Amino acid sequence: DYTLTRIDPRYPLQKQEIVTDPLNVFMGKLNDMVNWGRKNSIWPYNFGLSCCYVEMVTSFTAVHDVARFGAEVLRASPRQADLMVVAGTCFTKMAPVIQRLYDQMLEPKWVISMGACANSGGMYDIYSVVQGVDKFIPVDVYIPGCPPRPEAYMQALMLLQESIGKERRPLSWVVGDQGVYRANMQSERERKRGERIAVTNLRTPDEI
Amino acid sequence: MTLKELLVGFGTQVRSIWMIGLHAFAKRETRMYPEEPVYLPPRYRGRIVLTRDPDGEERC
Amino acid sequence: WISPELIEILLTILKAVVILLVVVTCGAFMSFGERRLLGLFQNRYGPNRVGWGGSLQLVADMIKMFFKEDWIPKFSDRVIFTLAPMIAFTSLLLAFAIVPVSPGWVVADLNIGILFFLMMAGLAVYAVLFAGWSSNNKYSLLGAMRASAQTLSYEVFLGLSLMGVVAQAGSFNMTDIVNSQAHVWNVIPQFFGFITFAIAGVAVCHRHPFDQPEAEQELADGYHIEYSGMKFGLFFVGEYIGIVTISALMVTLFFGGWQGPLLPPFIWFALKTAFFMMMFILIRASLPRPRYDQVMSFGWKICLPLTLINLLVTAAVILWQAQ
Amino acid sequence: MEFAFYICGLIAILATLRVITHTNPVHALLYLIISLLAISGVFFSLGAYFAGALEIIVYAGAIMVLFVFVVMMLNLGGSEIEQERQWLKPQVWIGPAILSAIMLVVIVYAILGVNDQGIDGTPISAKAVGITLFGPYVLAVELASMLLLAGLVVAFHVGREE
Amino acid sequence: STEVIAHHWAFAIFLIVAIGLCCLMLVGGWFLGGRARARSKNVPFESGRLSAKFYLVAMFFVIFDVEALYLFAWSTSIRESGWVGFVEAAIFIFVLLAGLVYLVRIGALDWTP
Amino acid sequence: DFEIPVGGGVSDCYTRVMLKVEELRQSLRILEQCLNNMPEGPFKADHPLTTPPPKERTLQHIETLITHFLQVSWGPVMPANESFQMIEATKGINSYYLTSDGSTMSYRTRIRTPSYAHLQQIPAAIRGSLVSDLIVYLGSIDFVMSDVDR
Ligand SMILES: CCCCCCCCCCCCCCCCCC(=O)OC[C@H](COP(=O)(O)OCCN)OC(=O)CCCCCCCCCCCCCCCCC
Ligand SMILES: CCCCCCCCCCCCCCCCCC(=O)OC[C@H](COP(=O)(O)OCCN)OC(=O)CCCCCCCCCCCCCCCCC
Ligand SMILES: CCCCCCCCCCCCCCCCCC(=O)OC[C@H](COP(=O)(O)OCCN)OC(=O)CCCCCCCCCCCCCCCCC
Ligand SMILES: CCCCCCCCCCCCCCCCCC(=O)OC[C@H](COP(=O)(O)OCCN)OC(=O)CCCCCCCCCCCCCCCCC
Ligand SMILES: CCCCCCCCCCCCCCCCCCCC
Numbered sequence A: 001d002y003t004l005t006r007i008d009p010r011y012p013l014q015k016q017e018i019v020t021d022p023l024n025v026f027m028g029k030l031n032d033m034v035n036w037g038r039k040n041s042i043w044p045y046n047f048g049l050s051c052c053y054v055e056m057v058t059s060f061t062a063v064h065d066v067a068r069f070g071a072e073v074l075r076a077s078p079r080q081a082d083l084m085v086v087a088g089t090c091f092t093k094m095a096p097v098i099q100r101l102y103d104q105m106l107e108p109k110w111v112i113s114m115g116a117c118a119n120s121g122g123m124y125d126i127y128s129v130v131q132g133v134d135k136f137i138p139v140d141v142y143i144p145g146c147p148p149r150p151e152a153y154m155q156a157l158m159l160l161q162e163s164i165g166k167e168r169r170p171l172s173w174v175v176g177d178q179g180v181y182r183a184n185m186q187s188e189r190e191r192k193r194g195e196r197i198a199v200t201n202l203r204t205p206d207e208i
Numbered sequence B: 001m002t003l004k005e006l007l008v009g010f011g012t013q014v015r016s017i018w019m020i021g022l023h024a025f026a027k028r029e030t031r032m033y034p035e036e037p038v039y040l041p042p043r044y045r046g047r048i049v050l051t052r053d054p055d056g057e058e059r060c
Numbered sequence C: 001w002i003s004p005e006l007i008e009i010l011l012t013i014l015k016a017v018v019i020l021l022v023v024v025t026c027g028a029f030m031s032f033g034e035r036r037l038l039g040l041f042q043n044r045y046g047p048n049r050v051g052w053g054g055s056l057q058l059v060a061d062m063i064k065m066f067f068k069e070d071w072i073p074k075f076s077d078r079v080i081f082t083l084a085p086m087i088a089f090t091s092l093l094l095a096f097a098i099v100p101v102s103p104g105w106v107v108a109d110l111n112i113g114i115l116f117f118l119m120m121a122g123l124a125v126y127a128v129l130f131a132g133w134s135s136n137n138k139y140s141l142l143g144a145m146r147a148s149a150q151t152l153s154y155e156v157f158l159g160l161s162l163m164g165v166v167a168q169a170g171s172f173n174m175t176d177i178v179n180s181q182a183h184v185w186n187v188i189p190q191f192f193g194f195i196t197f198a199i200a201g202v203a204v205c206h207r208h209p210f211d212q213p214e215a216e217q218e219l220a221d222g223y224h225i226e227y228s229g230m231k232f233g234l235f236f237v238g239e240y241i242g243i244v245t246i247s248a249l250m251v252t253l254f255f256g257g258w259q260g261p262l263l264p265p266f267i268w269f270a271l272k273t274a275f276f277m278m279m280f281i282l283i284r285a286s287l288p289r290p291r292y293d294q295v296m297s298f299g300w301k302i303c304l305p306l307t308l309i310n311l312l313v314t315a316a317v318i319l320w321q322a323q
Numbered sequence D: 001m002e003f004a005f006y007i008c009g010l011i012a013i014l015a016t017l018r019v020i021t022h023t024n025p026v027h028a029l030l031y032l033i034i035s036l037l038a039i040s041g042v043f044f045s046l047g048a049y050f051a052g053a054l055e056i057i058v059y060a061g062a063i064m065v066l067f068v069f070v071v072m073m074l075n076l077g078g079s080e081i082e083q084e085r086q087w088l089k090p091q092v093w094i095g096p097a098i099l100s101a102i103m104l105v106v107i108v109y110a111i112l113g114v115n116d117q118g119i120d121g122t123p124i125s126a127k128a129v130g131i132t133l134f135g136p137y138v139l140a141v142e143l144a145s146m147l148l149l150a151g152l153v154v155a156f157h158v159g160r161e162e
Numbered sequence E: 001s002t003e004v005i006a007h008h009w010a011f012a013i014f015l016i017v018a019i020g021l022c023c024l025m026l027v028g029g030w031f032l033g034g035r036a037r038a039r040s041k042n043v044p045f046e047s048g049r050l051s052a053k054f055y056l057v058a059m060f061f062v063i064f065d066v067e068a069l070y071l072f073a074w075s076t077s078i079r080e081s082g083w084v085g086f087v088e089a090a091i092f093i094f095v096l097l098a099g100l101v102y103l104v105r106i107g108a109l110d111w112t113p
Numbered sequence F: 001d002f003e004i005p006v007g008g009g010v011s012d013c014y015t016r017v018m019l020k021v022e023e024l025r026q027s028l029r030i031l032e033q034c035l036n037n038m039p040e041g042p043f044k045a046d047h048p049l050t051t052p053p054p055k056e057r058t059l060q061h062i063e064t065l066i067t068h069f070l071q072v073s074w075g076p077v078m079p080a081n082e083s084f085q086m087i088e089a090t091k092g093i094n095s096y097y098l099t100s101d102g103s104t105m106s107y108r109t110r111i112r113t114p115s116y117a118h119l120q121q122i123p124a125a126i127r128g129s130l131v132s133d134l135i136v137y138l139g140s141i142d143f144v145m146s147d148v149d150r
């Protein structure tokens, strides 16, 4: 129920294989402590592409307060950032810039596609748009929407936190196994199918 | 620069600090997602479903 | 080994170690309190989910920054790059090292005191200079040049702002400066010294509205841009420890230090210090950022003659009252 | 007191030797700052507290800041400096080193032939230095202000960009 | 005395423990955490000649810092110097402010052109 | 009933920002007038080319269902002509120039945006200034890059 990824510099320059979860009880507790610290302090790269970035900085404001999750520092440097939110369209002139900024980020790093443009190109199936940011960089969380509302971005933040909290990474670069192990978690569609199909009645659209 | 300009600017900085302090003495405007559920209007354009007729058959 | 002298030595060493650990913990918890008080100032809550009230957010950030990959650029010079956050931390920590928090609770009762603080600030400008040069980035280079010239423009009168309190107390010692405030606090006579020292201490701490990397983010010309992991964390922790140091020095130099009517002296010192930390947060959250030429013009044409005139008037008052 | 003096003197000597034999200007300036800190420690060991405070405030806090400022603006990448290493070439440096060596032995002969009752290390505060400065040394203060003014005017006139 | 040497020991322990604390912070940051490679990782982040006014500002800081050291020496001995030393320091500050005004009026302290 | 604020003759950053505050106040006045006087009537025109038709008539009338069926599948047939509309947008004047060739798709869609003009005006106005002046000028233009590029 895990995937093993090791990188060695077409993009992405990684190869993944399905592997059994390896997990002493002290090493496991240290791994959960490291994962807890990584998931409760996630610093996003302040990267503005399009309208989805306007919704992201709406999520950062007072009526939403994304600071409650410890994800508010909003670094302008990719070295100091933990999370790349592709919040906008992957234009062909901007795609090498996105690749360069993602390369300049440091491990551990995670990617959230925010919006239909970053997911698959969205409505812009046009000559000057890369059809999704997963064509050239690996994505951890996808948010459908055009735009997603700010609480959808927070929901993806919680999904990323839950994905980090059960993934395995080396504690030190001199001791252990240096490959990155990511959990193959259950899809949210199959998890929410029980509560979504049973919905019967909704409020009529003629009211407030 | 003018001394009067300096004094007016000092007073304006003090006024800005005072206003941010009274804004600290205000009510929180944050909607506490996810503990507070997000209210949506009935015609909100979110997740797409297919529905059924009152007889129970699918309407599509 | 049982002797009163060795016991006094070990208790003094333990007091110094306790003071140092409390200062480091207060600086980190004040980074967290910066976040929380900004949330309070901006009609929100800030981090209140990691632990009770967000109290474990600092531990989560510390674990993240320790286990973040620490990386040094190939084009960079290793020693200077590794040395700059060490300066940014150690200089203002050892600047705190002279601050008396209570009667009998001081690490170094030096005869120079705020002179030693001036030594540490003059060494602290090297952190910004070395971060700019070491990273081998031209944007960070001009950013560090701009920030360093700003800090020189305010360090040119930081000590002269302190000289009014020095003249009133008649000594460079910190404890004598506190004891001279037993009747009236120094904020009343040395009010111009108080505002000039506030401006200079904010500017040499690289705090808002004198912060350079937050001023121009579009240019990406900050000198922190190539630091990551525990080096950038040391930059931030040294910045907040410098805020604590400047606030405590302000309390001891203008607000009587630990002197108070009813509460224990450390309670008064902590209350006044935490009030000035809250005022740091309010200054960051309230004032807009001036331009570079405007900032250094305010440093040169206005504040330095004000400090010189304040020292002259303070001397005239002192020799007028000495019959 | 004496142990700190000897350690700081050794550190200053080794640091200065590293400055006069280096190719990187920033490394040389950093070693010069380290030697200034060590000489400040020597000053603090001898009871001249004000002298050490001024060494780190002014010498290691203003003048070396100015040198570092200039080296930053030059962007010295060692053009025909690291590619030459002519000071490390022996027949260049043998002469001046032996010149400074025989001068050092003559000065050491001068130093060793004087009466020495030892330095008691009594701390001389900055208050006494200030009393002397504005007492028996007043024309020194005013004409040193004029000297700093002269340096100000001279280096403003020279170091403009236009 | 015992108190002064205990103060010296406490100060030495303070400096040593602070330096060791930041050194161990570097050791923990460098030793812990996995490392991974990217092609543009080693390239400096550049968002995907310096003027002589910097030298002038640093120079003015140096000169006025030396005159500041003179006023530092004056300020700790103001009462014993009396009114005579007050007159000398007034002349000193008058020369300082005249030089400052001269620097202001000729645009030496004017950053913008 | 609303007023159009104007400046004194010089376009500073501060003058533009205060003007946009004034148009915010005037838009609040227009919103108050809209709230007090909203007519009772249809939300769609009775033209045969109203796309889509009113939904309930589509759901119970066969001719309306035919109109809706052809308007949402193939598209409505605009006769071959050229049209133009310019409006006062939130950032300037925004215009659509639409050339129809008689089909259900636009033959030409030309979108004029004011941000293109303002980004082109930048080098003439920021010349001889500082970099922070450029940052303030960028912040005071009221543009977006989707408006520029589109
Ligand atoms: C290095 C610094 C050198 C300069 C400072 C030296 C020390 C202080 C010396 C005294 C300063 C007095 C300043 C002038 C006060 C009266 C005029 C005034 O307030 O002008 C500012 C502003 C003018 O109004 P305007 O900008 O035209 O706006 C249109 C509304 N009529 O009016 C306003 O904004 C409204 C009124 C604001 C009043 C603010 C408080 C004034 C008094 C402050 C005393 C000290 C407070 C210390 C901090 C306390 C809170 C933490
Ligand atoms: C522990 C220590 C610290 C504790 C925290 C509390 C103290 C923090 C102090 C922060 C000080 C910030 C000072 C910022 C000065 C900025 C000066 C400047 O450059 O102003 C530029 C502006 C316009 O300049 P001008 O040349 O006229 O431009 C014309 C172009 N059209 O000119 C103007 O706007 C004119 C007025 C300039 C500013 C005057 C000084 C204001 C200082 C801030 C208010 C402090 C009030 C007291 C707060 C409580 C203190 C306990
Ligand atoms: C990367 C590392 C770089 C180097 C870092 C520092 C290296 C040395 C660290 C170990 C130091 C051990 C302790 C040294 C002695 C401390 C006590 C002392 O100096 O006592 C003497 C004196 C006592 O004063 P007092 O009692 O008032 O005098 C009356 C007569 N007893 O008190 C005095 O004279 C006080 C004045 C001197 C205090 C010096 C403090 C350190 C100065 C260097 C700071 C370096 C900052 C970081 C690097 C900057 C860039 C290079
Ligand atoms: C340990 C082996 C070497 C390890 C590597 C180097 C580490 C740094 C070594 C130099 C600095 C520390 C020297 C040791 C000081 C220990 C304390 C001491 O000796 O105090 C004596 C004296 C106290 O004052 P006093 O009143 O004279 O005492 C008489 C008794 N009542 O003290 C004094 O009067 C003044 C004490 C010295 C001045 C203060 C500290 C100056 C620090 C300068 C650092 C220079 C840069 C070092 C860089 C290192 C890496 C290259
Ligand atoms: C921001 C404040 C930083 C303070 C750093 C130093 C802390 C020292 C704590 C000393 C505590 C004991 C003080 C003497 C006893 C009198 C007070 C008793 C009640 C606390």
Ligand SMILES: CCCCCCCCCCCCCCCCCCCC
Residues within 6 Å of the ligand: D095, D096, D098, D099
């Ligand atoms: C291109 C110009 C280069 C000039 C280099 C100058 C080098 C001078 C070296 C002097 C060496 C003196 C050696 C000792 C001489 C005898 C003892 C001193 C005089 C009694």
Ligand code: SF4
Residues within 6 Å of the ligand: A050, A051, A052, A053, A087, A088, A089, A114, A115, A116, A117, A118, A122, A145, A146, A147, A148
């Ligand atoms: S998905 Fe929609 S809202 Fe998001 S960037 Fe694309 S067009 Fe804008």
